[PDB]
Each structure stands twice: as structure tokens, then as C-alpha cells.
Amino acid sequence: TRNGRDSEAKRLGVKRFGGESVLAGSIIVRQRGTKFHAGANVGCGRDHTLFAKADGKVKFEVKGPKNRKFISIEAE
Amino acid sequence: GFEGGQMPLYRRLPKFGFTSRKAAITAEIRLSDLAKVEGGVVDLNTLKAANIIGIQIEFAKVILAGEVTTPVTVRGLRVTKGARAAIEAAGGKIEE
Amino acid sequence: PKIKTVRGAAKRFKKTGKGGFKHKHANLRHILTKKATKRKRHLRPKAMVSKGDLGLVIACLPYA
Amino acid sequence: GIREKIKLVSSAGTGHFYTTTKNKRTKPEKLELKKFDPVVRQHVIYKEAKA
RNA sequence: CUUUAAUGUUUGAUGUUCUAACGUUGACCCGUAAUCCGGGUUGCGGACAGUGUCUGGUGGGUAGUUUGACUGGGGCGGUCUCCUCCUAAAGAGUAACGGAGGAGCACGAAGGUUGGCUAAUCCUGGUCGGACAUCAGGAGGUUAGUGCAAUGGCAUAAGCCAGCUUGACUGCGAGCGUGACGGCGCGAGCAGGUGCGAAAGCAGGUCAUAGUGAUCCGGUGGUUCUGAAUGGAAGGGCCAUC
RNA sequence: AAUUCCUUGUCGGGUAAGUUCCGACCUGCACGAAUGGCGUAAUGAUGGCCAGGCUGUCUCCACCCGAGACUCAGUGAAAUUGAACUCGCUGUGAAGAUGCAGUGUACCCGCGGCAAGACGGAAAGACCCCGUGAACCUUUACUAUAGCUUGACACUGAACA
RNA sequence: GUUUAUUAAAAACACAGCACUGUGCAAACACGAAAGUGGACGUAUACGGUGUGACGCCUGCCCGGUGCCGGAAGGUUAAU
RNA sequence: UGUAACGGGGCUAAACCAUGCACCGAAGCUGCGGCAGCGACGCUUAUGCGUUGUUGGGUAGGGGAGCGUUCUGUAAGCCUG
RNA sequence: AGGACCGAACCGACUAAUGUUGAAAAAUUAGCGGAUGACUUGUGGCUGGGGGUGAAAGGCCAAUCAAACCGGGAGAUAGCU
RNA sequence: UUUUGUAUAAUGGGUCAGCGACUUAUAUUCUGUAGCAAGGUUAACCGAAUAGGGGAGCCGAAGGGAAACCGAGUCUUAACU
Ligand SMILES: [Mg+2]
Ligand SMILES: [Mg+2]
Ligand SMILES: [Mg+2]
Ligand SMILES: [Mg+2]
Ligand SMILES: [Mg+2]
Ligand SMILES: [Mg+2]
Ligand SMILES: [Mg+2]
Ligand SMILES: [Mg+2]
Ligand SMILES: [Mg+2]
Ligand SMILES: [Mg+2]
Ligand SMILES: [Mg+2]
Ligand SMILES: [Mg+2]
Ligand SMILES: [Mg+2]
Ligand SMILES: [Mg+2]
Ligand SMILES: [Mg+2]
Ligand SMILES: [Mg+2]
Ligand SMILES: [Mg+2]
Ligand SMILES: [Mg+2]
Ligand SMILES: [Mg+2]
Ligand SMILES: [Mg+2]
Ligand SMILES: [Mg+2]
Ligand SMILES: [Mg+2]
Ligand SMILES: [Mg+2]
Ligand SMILES: [Mg+2]
Ligand SMILES: [Mg+2]
Ligand SMILES: [Mg+2]
Ligand SMILES: [Mg+2]
Ligand SMILES: [Mg+2]
Ligand SMILES: [Mg+2]
Ligand SMILES: [Mg+2]
Ligand SMILES: [Mg+2]
Ligand SMILES: [Mg+2]
Ligand SMILES: [Mg+2]
Ligand SMILES: [Mg+2]
Ligand SMILES: [Mg+2]
Ligand SMILES: [Mg+2]
Ligand SMILES: [Mg+2]
Ligand SMILES: [Mg+2]
Ligand SMILES: [Mg+2]
Ligand SMILES: [Mg+2]
């Protein structure tokens, strides 16, 4: 019975794209599940935010037998 | 302060602190002030006469501000580590 | 006549060295058991008034 | 919602307390948990009490 | 002393009387050629009634005011905070009384860690047993499962057991995200102390995203703060918390 | 039905024809016994209905008599008014045009007449909504309060049980 | 009879009549911080209030709710 | 209400397709002259002027520069039977 | 005898027309009700604004009464035009 | 004038003349300008009175902390990378 409701947008998504240079700690993705998984020099917080563990350049790759999306950070 | 009806910032946020009645009868003295007293002896009394601190003042601290070019004597005053060095470099005496 | 100070503002803000204002964080008064220790930790220290609000606070504390 | 707030108190002399909740019905006994007492800067047994 | 009476005693309770406070809108005298008032006498009442201050109830008799906004006019209905999907035009964000749903909890384990495990559904066989319980084989391959809505995730499992446990740690925090602000969030790393593991290592709650309430006033505990002449105290601040 | 929504209920009366009136039925949407029921002679500038007379009320208007209206002399207002060299049609267009477009028509000015238009005059819409306007009014809205009522002390004492 | 002087004269108000109910007189009640006064130079066959509305025939059932009247035992309860 | 469903006249193209080259057409561009703002640079800097790019529709609104009224000083001055 | 009948004065105001920048801020004309009664009318008195008076319409209280009129608070306030 | 938009048949104005609306005081800040400058400045008063006197005050040269306090540092914390 009756519609009319929604919730605030959570402003998720990619925050730094391929190549963007970041200082450690910078959030690279906000996500709900692990669409992107954390790779080298990247951390995964409790809401599956991927963040930088090192200064460097953001690098998206696809790795492994499940073709999962991975984010790493290359030193620059 | 009115913001349209929204609970304004000066209500939104909480109060803090108390006011120290002692802070208000406690004053700071600069090194640049030590020469400004007629007599080379710095007490509360000396300083009041030279119009450097207020009359109702009961406590004072000499701080490291300005410079001191004359051996001066200080008495009954608190002195910071720095101020003590500057007064003493110039030959002064710090007595309780 | 003299401007009159908005006194609840003066009981909530203090002026700092470069002309800003410090204030106490909201949200640390009660209903505490449920709040993460981290959140309450980060609300203990005082903070600076944001740019958007200086007009309001300054209007209220003409003698600050 | 039926879940009551309680305080766990430090077994040392300090009056330090953590705060939590309890289903006081199904688990009526006193909650007792080792936690860090920041006043003696050591881990100590903490024992349930009223709020 | 053990008990018991009664006189004699303190203050209450309860009466019954008295008169001398007070009432007299009985009668009388005088001021006075006066249906006022005063004074006197007299009867009648009498510590009542009545009045003052305090107090419970009653009190539209009077008074002052309140009685929301959104809205394809208004009213009625419905709706107001929060979460999830769609609308939403492949970054973010994005309206409508557009289309579906859900929260205002739960868990001392359903949290931590080490070790371990792998669903659903169908066919065949099997005591009571059945279309469907438990047992076995095969197929299958996560269609299961997740405390619950939706989406997104999850096998390295985040899904299912077990042991030891309290990191559902205290102080901080590079650097970020998101916000007009108030705020909210993510976060390696540092210090202290801790659990699990041989160890590398993990742990600052729960697969994530709802499960919520600013300020004031006030309660409780702590406190090297403050303490209106002085020492205390009260009040105040500071930390925790309701 | 002073009450009946459906409803011009049905039936009967009156009428050539009667959504009303009279009389009935009861299916009273939603009469009812002193916030009175049912009746009631008389009464009424009271409501509905019907008939005799009556007539210009009408078919359908004629003529006449006076007061105006019209002409001359005297006096002499008014509302309104951005400014006007102030036409019709179809269309355009702040969406219903003397004023724009296109076309048609029209020689200059009065006088008596009519009221289709100037969204004509008149009053800053009374309906409708809005304002965290106003005023009276109601009440088991809130808060107070006169009053009424309760008791404690006070004015207020004595004696005996 | 009365009424909205100035858009409503009526089926509205009044009315005799009826009932309820208060009032023992310094009445109730009304005006009044009070004194004083109307009620009344009256006295329950009087006075006030309230509702009905000549008269004839009548006026049934309900006291649960609201209100009022009565109650004194308990419970609860102010100043003190 | 009146032609009233090309604005009209009228048109068999003065309609439609197609090709082509002409021309009309605006406060757009160019030409001649002029002013200002902003730059820059200069003949030479007392900041003006000079050359020279370039800009100059405008409501709410912000900024700059001014005209002009009455009154005080300048003023027993200056104009005025 | 009668809040009895018919009907002038008196008192009232049911219809209609006229008037509506009026003869008139409520009337004129024709008709109309009461007309010994709860009648009518003259003079003078009393009742005062949350107050009066009301055979009750929220009527009347000096041409505007769901709170008179004058002065004052007073430049009330006016998120409106 | 108001407006999304007004020749609008939306508003105001019959015409002229005169009047008619961002002021003033005290605070406070910022800009411009003048003085003085780690200083600047006086208020009431006095007064030889726009002089001069008067420095009570006020602002500034020091901050941090809720405060004690410390101080070019302070708070936080047992301590801070
Ligand atoms: Mg609000
Ligand atoms: Mg001084
Ligand atoms: Mg607190
Ligand atoms: Mg008594
Ligand atoms: Mg009221
Ligand atoms: Mg509304
Ligand atoms: Mg998107
Ligand atoms: Mg997009
Ligand atoms: Mg494992
Ligand atoms: Mg089987
Ligand atoms: Mg070990
Ligand atoms: Mg779980
Ligand atoms: Mg004291
Ligand atoms: Mg003391
Ligand atoms: Mg009938
Ligand atoms: Mg009559
Ligand atoms: Mg004439
Ligand atoms: Mg016109
Ligand atoms: Mg008109
Ligand atoms: Mg209007
Ligand atoms: Mg109006
Ligand atoms: Mg009338
Ligand atoms: Mg009439
Ligand atoms: Mg009646
Ligand atoms: Mg009855
Ligand atoms: Mg009783
Ligand atoms: Mg043709
Ligand atoms: Mg061509
Ligand atoms: Mg041209
Ligand atoms: Mg040009
Ligand atoms: Mg008669
Ligand atoms: Mg007549
Ligand atoms: Mg008669
Ligand atoms: Mg008279
Ligand atoms: Mg005033
Ligand atoms: Mg005004
Ligand atoms: Mg409009
Ligand atoms: Mg506009
Ligand atoms: Mg117009
Ligand atoms: Mg006009």
C-alpha cells in the first residue's frame, strides 16, 4: 500500500580513475560488495571502500581465473 | 543569527567553559616593559606607577617578548624560561 | 547605543589567533552507549567554524 | 527495544566503566568480561551493574 | 522491681456547659422634632458564625491564546524521519500525491582468531515413511545460504561447525569521501595493553548499506580544574554516562 | 409529512391534460409523547390548493386626458476622463481587438431616439485561497482566574467530664 | 400582543395554562471590592430559576455514559 | 457576423522535382568620420598626452565620473537702477 | 362585560408601483393592521461600553454596535500591496 | 506598475502648479584618506577655552588551554611517530 519513498543517494562510485596519482589513504572506490577487489597497495575497509596504502598511480587490472576486477597502486 | 527557522548554529552546537575570575587579575609583562619603569626594579607596584599594568592586578608573568637592554631586577613575578634567560643575559636578577 | 552581544553565541564560540572561532562539537551530550567510541573520540576536541558560518557568528559577537 | 542499557564496571578501584546493553530476560546473569581499564592502563575484569 | 488500682498530674482527642471576645437586619434610652450612624441598657446567640493569610477541589462565569505544512484550488484521504531498486539519459547527482518494498530491532555470540567444512533441486534404492522427514548412490554446481527489505557482494568463502577467547580494546591518526552548515563516513600507521595462531599474521564489533533525536535544563560516578575576605563547602568546568 | 433520499413512490379524487392540493396505503433513507404526541371550535396583512364574480393580467393592443420627454428664453449640476485623427469583417495576439496584419467600407458636423460593444460607471471581490492577520462565539482544547466549596492558623476565652 | 429603526412581521418571541426545582427570611437570587440596595415594606396560596405553551384525549420503556441529589466505611489525598 | 484552410491581388506557373548563374535582402561584415573603456607600447615618463590592438544590447544588482538646487566660508570681495 | 366587533383621529408598516446623481441617506401614492388596551402620547429622571437595555432580532444605546463615541499608548504591528 | 509574458479588455493617473519617500543618533566593521607608529588616543572635567591641561580608560605589540597554568609556544595524551 502506497509508494512514495526513497533514500539518499550514497554518492558511490569511482573516485580516482586509471592513472590518477594519489597519496596513501585516498579512497579509490566506494562500493557495496567487492565489485573491484583490492590488489597491491590497496586496502579494503568495512564498507568495501578501496583505499590507497601507498603514494602512487591508480591502476585497474583484471586478474585471475574468475576475471575479477582488481585495483592496485603502482609507484610512479 | 536567524537562519530561516532552522535550529541555528549558536543553538545547534553546545555551550562550553567557565570564566576564571583569576585570569582577570593576572597580567603578562613583556621584556620591552622592564626598562619603562622608573627605577630598574620591577614589581607590581613599579609597573603600576609606570602605567604598564592595571591597578586591580594581583599577579604577573614576564614573557619573552621584545628585548631587554638593561640589567633589571624583578621581584614577586613569575618568569618564563626564556624571559629568565633574557633578563639574566642582560645582568638582571630574578628574586621571589 | 552599544551593540548588544548575542549571549548564547558568546557561550558557544571563542575567537582564535588568526581571527576564526572555536566551538564544541555537537552530538556528545547523551545517548552515548550506542555511539562508536571512535566517533565520540573525534568529537572531544574543539573545532573551527566553517567559512559559510563566519558571517553568522561574527554578526552575533561584535565585541569578540 | 526490550534490550536494556547496562554498565560494566572495572574491578580495580577506578570508577571506570564501559557501557553496553543486555537482553536482561533470557540472559539474566551478570555479564563479566575482561577489558582495558585506562586508569590503571591494564586489562582487568569488568563486571555488570545497573545504569 | 514482678505486676495492679486509684487519686494527684502534661498535652492532645471527644464532648457538655458558661460569658467576657464577636453577631444581632428584637425591644428600649440618649445624642435628636432623625426607619443613618454612635454610646448606653436589655433580650437573643456565642467562641459558633464571619473576616484575614495559607491550602485541596470546583470553576467557559470571565480572560489570554493554540488548533502544522505538502496538496495539479481547498477540504476529505494520504504523506512528513531513515534504507534499498527503478524513473536516472553507461562518473556523481537529479523531480513528481511516479513505480515496488523495508527500518525505528537483533546477537556476549549471531563478536574475535585458529583449524575445519560446502549448498539448492531432480532420478534410483531403502522399516513403519506418505508427493515431502532420516539413510545411500548418481546427476547438478550455488539456482543454496546470509538474524530481515532491495540491490550489490561473497568459495581465499562474507555461507556451516568446533576449540581458545573479549580487539563489541583506551589514547591518536597520514590521507581521503560526502556535505550550505550542524555533521556523517572510510582509514593505513603510531603508543599502551590484549585475544587467537607454531608462524607469516589477523582483531578498534556483525558481508555492506536502515535499526534514529541537535540544543538547553537536569540525574549519577570520576576529577593535578575552579572555590566571591581566608580554609572548607555549595555551585561551576573538565572526562564518562543517564 | 414544515420530517420521504430514491420520488413526478402507489392508489383514489379533482382537470381535456394536475412534479402542486385533498384522501389513502407504510417501504418512517431519517415522526413520537412538556428539547412534548395526536387532535381541536375560534383567531391570522401567515404557507399550499380549488371555485363563483371580476376585469387589459393575457389573446393583442387601440384611443383618449393630464405631468415629463422636444422647441425658445433665464439659471445651471453630475459620475468619468493616459492621450485619441475613436469604422466593419477574418485572422494575430497576455489566449474574446476602433488601435497589430490582411482586406472591405466610409465626403465634413449635428439633432431626436435604442442600449449590442467600449470585458462600459460605481465599491482596492463579500464567493475561493493565502497571512504562522483581526474579532466575537463554543466546548469534556490549554493555561489562568471571580465566584462556590475544603481544611490549617489568626481574631478566640473559661469550667467540668 | 411582540420582533430584526433602514431588504425577513412569520411557523420566530410572548402568552395564560403545566411541570421541574431552589428558597424558613439577614431567603434564594441579582447589583456592589465594601457599605448599601433590589427581591419586599413581600414571608412557601410568597419569591427566584429552568423547560413546555389555551383546551380536549394523553405523555410508554432506559439510570449504562454525562449532570445533579444522597451516602459514610475503606482506598487516595493540601496546607500543617 | 463576411470572401476567411496562399497576408491580398492574381498565377498553370507566379505550382512541384532538378541543375545552374544573377540579384534584393539586416542595426551582421566592409568603407569614411567621431567618442569612450581596457591594454599595451610609446613622441617621451611629473600621468597626461600621443600612437595602437581590442571592447562598448541589457533587468535585479555592484562599481566609476559628474550637472544642478538651498545654506556657511572665501566676500567690506565681485556684478548690479 | 370584553387584551370583544366595524371604523376616523392616534399608533403601526402587509402588498404594489414611483423614486434610486430622490422632494427624502428609508419617503410618496393607492390599498393594509391595531384602534378601552400587554393601547397611545408630552415633560422630567434613571440604567454606561464586556457595560446597559432586550415580549429575544445579536435588536437598540445620537444616520454604520458580534462590543458606542472622543483623546491617549500611537509613528501598534503590517514576512502584504 | 506587476509579471513566464501586457497594445492588452491587467494596475495607477481628468490637466497644471507647489509639497511628497533610504534619514538621524549611538555603536560596530570594511574601504578611501590624513596624522602619529610598536605604538596610537584620550573620556568626564579643568580651561588661559576650537589652544592648553587631563592618559581614568580603550585598542595593539602573544598565544594555547574549560581552568589552574604555561608561554613562542600551548593543549591533547601516561607519551606522542
Ligand atoms: Mg520548526
Ligand atoms: Mg593605565
Ligand atoms: Mg557530559
Ligand atoms: Mg471558619
Ligand atoms: Mg474563551
Ligand atoms: Mg496549506
Ligand atoms: Mg548515475
Ligand atoms: Mg549519466
Ligand atoms: Mg580459515
Ligand atoms: Mg524416494
Ligand atoms: Mg602465542
Ligand atoms: Mg554474520
Ligand atoms: Mg562568601
Ligand atoms: Mg573563599
Ligand atoms: Mg397527503
Ligand atoms: Mg395580530
Ligand atoms: Mg435652455
Ligand atoms: Mg480600449
Ligand atoms: Mg466595471
Ligand atoms: Mg481586493
Ligand atoms: Mg476583502
Ligand atoms: Mg426592516
Ligand atoms: Mg417587510
Ligand atoms: Mg416552544
Ligand atoms: Mg417521557
Ligand atoms: Mg457527591
Ligand atoms: Mg484567388
Ligand atoms: Mg535553385
Ligand atoms: Mg544596410
Ligand atoms: Mg556594427
Ligand atoms: Mg378589542
Ligand atoms: Mg398609506
Ligand atoms: Mg378596528
Ligand atoms: Mg424622555
Ligand atoms: Mg508603543
Ligand atoms: Mg501605522
Ligand atoms: Mg499572470
Ligand atoms: Mg522578473
Ligand atoms: Mg489599461
Ligand atoms: Mg482609472
Distance of CA B5 to the CA centre of its chain: 44
Residue C8: count other Cβ atoms within 10 Å of its Cβ.
14
Which chains are within 8 Å of D by 3+ CB pairs?
C
The Cα D47–Cα D51 span in angstroms is: 13
Resolution to one decimal, Å: 2.9
Cell digits for B11? 543553538
Closest residue by Cα to residue C59 from C28, C21, C17: C21
Q: What is the CATH number of the domain that holds B27?
A: 3.100.10.10
Determined by X-ray
Helices (H) and strands (E) in chain A, counts: 0, 8
Nearest to C46 by CA among C1, C18, C15, C8: C15
**In the block, residue with C-alpha cell 618564563:** B80
Task: Please say whether the beta carbons of B70 and B37 come within 8 A.
Answer: no
Cβ atoms of residues D17 and D10 within 8 Å: yes
| Domains of chain C, residue spans | 1-64
Q: What are the C-alpha distances in Å from A7 to residues A13, A59, B6, C4?
A: 17, 32, 22, 44
C56, B3: Cβ pair inside 8 Å?
Answer: yes
User: What is the 8-class DSSP label of residue A24?
Assistant: T
Establish if B37 belongs to a structural domain.
yes
How remote is the CA of residue B76 from the centroid of ligand 5, in Å? 73
* DSSP 8-state secondary structure symbol assigned to residue C54: H
Residues in chain D, total: 51
Measuring CA to CA, how many Å separate C32 from each of A18, A65, B15, C37?
42, 47, 18, 9
Asked if the structure places residue B13 within a domain, the reply is: no
What is the rounded CA–CA span in Å between residue A10 and residue A48? 14
Answer whether any strand J atom is within 7 A of the Cβ of C5.
no
- Amino acid of residue A10: K
3-state secondary structure of A26: coil
Three-class secondary structure of residue D51 per DSSP: coil
Domain that holds residue B83: 21-94
* Residue B11 counted as domain residue: no
C-alpha of A12 from chain center: 10
Handedness of CA B14, B20, B25, B30 (dihedral sign): negative
B23 touching chain C per CB within 8 A: no
Kindly list the protein residues that place their beta carbon closer than 5 angstroms to ligand 2, a single-atom ion.
B 51
Please indicate whether, in this complex, the C-beta atoms of B10 and C26 are within 8 angstroms of each other: no
- Residue owning grid cell 557495496: A32
Q: What nucleotide is nearest B29 when CA is compared to C1'?
A: J62
Domains of chain B: total: 1
Residue-range domains of chain A with CATH = 13-74 (2.40.50.100)
**In chain A, beta strands by DSSP E:** 13-14, 21-22, 27-30, 36-38, 42-44, 50-52, 56-63, 68-74
- The reply to whether B4 falls in a domain is no
Name the β-bridge partners of A74. A57
Of B residues 9-68, those with CB within 7 angstroms of nucleic strand J are 16-20, 22-23, 26, 28, 30, 32-33, 51-52, 54-55, 59, 61, 63-66
